Symmetry: D2
Subunit: 247 residues, 4 copies
């Protein structure tokens, strides 16, 4: 009788905070992961200790290929197998690295466009075909002021705005809402050094600090809740004003 | 200890639903009105029966004039006098009517640009000068880029209000004051507009071919003032059931 | 006969470059000015020496007041009195200065909202009521969504001007009048600004690390009024060397 | 030899043909890329070469996404250097367009709609820049934010193309390469379409109740590649007759 949600890339960082906060709200969860098997199993163990039979894991690579549609169908199917329903899809998984214009390029394309855009589209198709239903896409507040040399990443995130709009329009007559949450700087890349992390922190007007994963998850919670039942096609920036700051 | 909010144009329709919902969340509220004294007092009586001394009214005309700055200063002061603090400003009051390019024009300017943009700007200055979880929410319009025919001054005022939302979010972020917007599409239809004209609009909305209730607008305001939006500033949330996505 | 154009704020800087380029394209021009009478008369003299009876001046304050509608009416009338027709209006005049949230405030509203938005609206109404390739070009700002700190009234006026561009393109299309904007990033820096500060702005621009020339701004205006933009209405072209794409 | 050269993708018919012709009229030598329309492409190249010898060649390539697309896009750019010794302008015009309802395999639909609309432009942009008034013009869509029902993959590819236009403008600005877009609204309508359906679209356009000609779209491309646009990068000019301003 509890609703169920799929969260992609939910083993760590922002997807983990979203899975935790959905679980705290009453949801049963599918924790999708690609490589982070130990962290995924550890999170599902922690949620199941809190309410038994309320969490499963589901492994899949979201890189574009001719078998991506079957993998995305399987992610949705795993929610129905464990819980008998699927009320919420959160498209959180994402590849992120530079692709300068001046891995082979076709693998770069498959990974950055597949995880950020194609996989969300196919998960959206499988979600809708299997049916307060809603989908939330993790977008990027800086998509119009992009990082230098991130053209494929930026293309995938713009494509994800277009999917949020197109699917909100096409799925409205089934009662499925589709919206996005657009972080600015939240948890900084593990690879990143401390002086560089501070450099980004200092650009944020509201507090000169990055968003916690929980602050990002809070906006996801609102969008799936009964307090957003007339909201579809909207993207909420959660960026502390970063996107307002000129060069 | 209980936070306090000012809601402009709070006697009826969307501003009333926002004042009720804040009061329900535990805020003390200033109900601002221009011509609707009876309705504003009736709301205040209903809220003070629930919790004593938690709602006052405040009269002001928000037309642009040489006295609008004094009027905006008084609205904010009335919150500080009644409650000792002012944590939230909701700029909800709005004039709305057509102004064909082909009332004197300068009166139309004073109402459509004065209430919709200049009063928000002056209220924002007074709110910020007199300064927690402090935030301002501006009622924007989700159809600002696909405007109604012959509504140029209205459309100009609502675009100015987006500019104020972004500029004030940037400038007040250092003070811990967040500034955001909520942009309805079709909500409560204008009372005058015929019931056939209203049906035409409802049928265009993707989500449930109906208008937003006022309470659905109020729900987004409540989120943006809450501790769940503490990193959000300069954001405008559309609450339009998808209407702004629909091509001609 | 040659077509005719009004350019507001045309005595110096970008408005001068626009009047010169329209004149070199074959237009008769009304050179509007406020304070710069010597520079205005000097430019008309230069253009008249190149072709006689092709340039006049017209003085008007574009600050908002109860007489702004008459002054805007008179600017348009001056083009009809001089040249028998008015084909193009360029809304270039602009006040620009900080208005921190934390002159009287009502004077700042009247200047920054009057010159940047209300005057363009009233000149658009008079241009359309007095009515081939008719169009209006509004000088907008490429950085309206990443505003300079403490410039809220200026930013509000330039957002209102984007609103007017869209609303008037919509409403005047049935009459064959196109309405478009040109949005500079950094072009001619303010006269008062020191070289050190000008260089800080230059270094932000991806394309060439320099500001736009007045002539580069004028080239986009010339395109939008030309027969090469006959299907373009409601468009704002940024001429900013990529500045608006640069993150913090 | 001193004449510049341009690649136009999908140039055998319709918009891409009108862009190839106008570039050639301006003094460019042209590579006419095609996929299936060999007879039309050769017919165009022959007409252009009759006008001026040795100024047009054709180049065949499928721009669907695949492991060989990178090599194909490299060869299109290479064909311009082999034919003409230089490549000054890339116009990304080729486009697949058909509905992909959420409720041909889906992976073919992905390869065709995302490869032609977005990945091929990116690979062509990489190859163009690696081999270097240089500029790229991408054919975008004015109605991206108000999309046709059941066109999600087409709409995703055209949003990805906006992102490429902005990202590549920022990254290539240090090499002097400008990157811009032209966004038609409704231009030449599908061959198949009955006049009664074409009229439903025509009627929605404010400026003239008609679609843009291919020439009107080509005119905006000519402006962006010209010396009149030398400070413009990262901008998308809508050429849509006001269509995108019209609410449902
Ligand atoms: N963090 C920020 O500052 C920020 C800023 C703007 C936008 N965002 C957006 O917010 C979302 C969450 O951000 P984040 O920093 O938490 O993300 P992240 O840690 O960079 O990535 C999230 C997860 O995505 C999964 N992933 C990557 N490649 C994949 C593939 N090929 N197949 C399947 N899964 C794959 C990984 O799962 P495994 O670990 O299981 O391999 C990874 O843990 C992302 O969509 C991001 O673009 C974040
Ligand atoms: N209703 C919708 O569907 C919709 C759609 C888009 C945007 N919005 C926006 O949402 C907000 C609320 O909408 P609504 O329909 O509830 O608004 P509304 O009923 O049109 O007006 C709200 C209140 O504004 C006050 N007001 C009007 N002119 C004024 C003046 N010169 N001085 C002081 N107050 C004045 C009036 O208060 P008194 O009654 O006390 O005189 C009025 O009751 C507005 O900002 C509006 O622009 C609403
Ligand atoms: N310059 C830039 O880098 C830049 C950047 C972004 C946007 N823009 C926009 O591009 C346009 C041209 O820029 P600019 O730097 O050439 O403009 P500007 O020199 O700052 O102003 C142009 C003219 O505006 C007129 N003006 C000011 N207040 C007025 C009033 N109350 N009544 C009537 N006229 C008034 C003045 O005429 P008098 O001298 O006769 O008094 C002035 O010469 C402006 O709209 C500006 O906002 C410029
Ligand atoms: N027409 C409009 O109303 C309109 C509206 C909005 C945007 N646009 C945009 O404007 C541009 C031109 O419009 P249009 O109507 O002229 O285009 P179109 O006729 O639909 O297509 C242009 C050419 O694209 C090529 N193309 C299609 N699939 C391809 C593939 N898999 N590989 C390589 N080339 C392929 C085809 O070449 P072959 O014929 O040689 O196979 C076709 O002739 C397009 O980007 C379009 O999206 C047009
Ligand atoms: N999947 C993810 N998407 C995003 C998007 C934005 C951000 S924070 C902003 C930011 C952080 C790092 C850089 C940067 O230059 N990173 C280098 C880099 C390359 C590959 C992996 C990790 C970091 C640029 C912008 C973080 C993430 S995580
Ligand atoms: N009417 C006018 N509007 C504008 C708008 C922008 C610019 S250039 C950028 C700029 C110039 C001065 C300042 C400043 O702080 N004074 C900040 C930014 C110059 C002008 S002149
Ligand atoms: N490659 C191309 N991209 C586009 C984009 C828009 C248009 S005209 C608008 C339109 C025409 C036909 C349909 C249709 O449903 N078929 C929908 C919209 C035509 C084209 S052709």
């Amino acid at each position: 009788e509890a609703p169920a949600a799929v969260v992609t890339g939910a083993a760590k960082r922002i997807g983990r905070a979203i899975a935790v906060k959905l679980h705290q709200t009453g949801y049963r969860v599918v924790i999708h992961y690609h490589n982070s098997a130990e962290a995924a199993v550890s999170l599902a163990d922690e949620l199941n200790k809190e309410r038994s039979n309320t969490a499963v894991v589901c492994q899949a690579d979201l890189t574009n290929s001719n078998v991506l549609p079957a993998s995305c169908e399987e992610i949705i199917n795993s929610c129905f197998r464990a819980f008998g329903r699927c009320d919420v899809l959160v498209n959180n998984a994402s590849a992120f690295y530079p692709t300068p214009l001046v891995k082979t390029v076709e693998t770069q394309v498959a990974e950055l466009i597949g995880t950020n855009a194609i996989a969300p589209f196919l998960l959206t198709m499988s979600f809708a075909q299997r049916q307060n239903l809603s989908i939330v896409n993790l977008c990027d507040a800086m998509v119009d002021q992009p990082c230098m040399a991130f053209s494929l990443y930026n293309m995938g995130k713009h494509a994800l705005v277009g999917l949020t709009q197109s699917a909100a329009l096409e799925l409205a007559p089934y009662g499925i809402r589709v919206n996005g949450v657009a972080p600015g700087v939240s948890l900084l890349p593990v690879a990143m050094g401390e002086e560089e992390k501070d450099k980004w922190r200092r650009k944020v007007p509201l507090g000169r600090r990055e968003a916690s994963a929980e602050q990002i998850a809070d906006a996801v919670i609102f969008l799936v809740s009964g307090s957003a039942q007339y909201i579809t096609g909207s993207i909420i920036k959660v960026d502390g004003g970063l996107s307002l700051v000129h060069a």
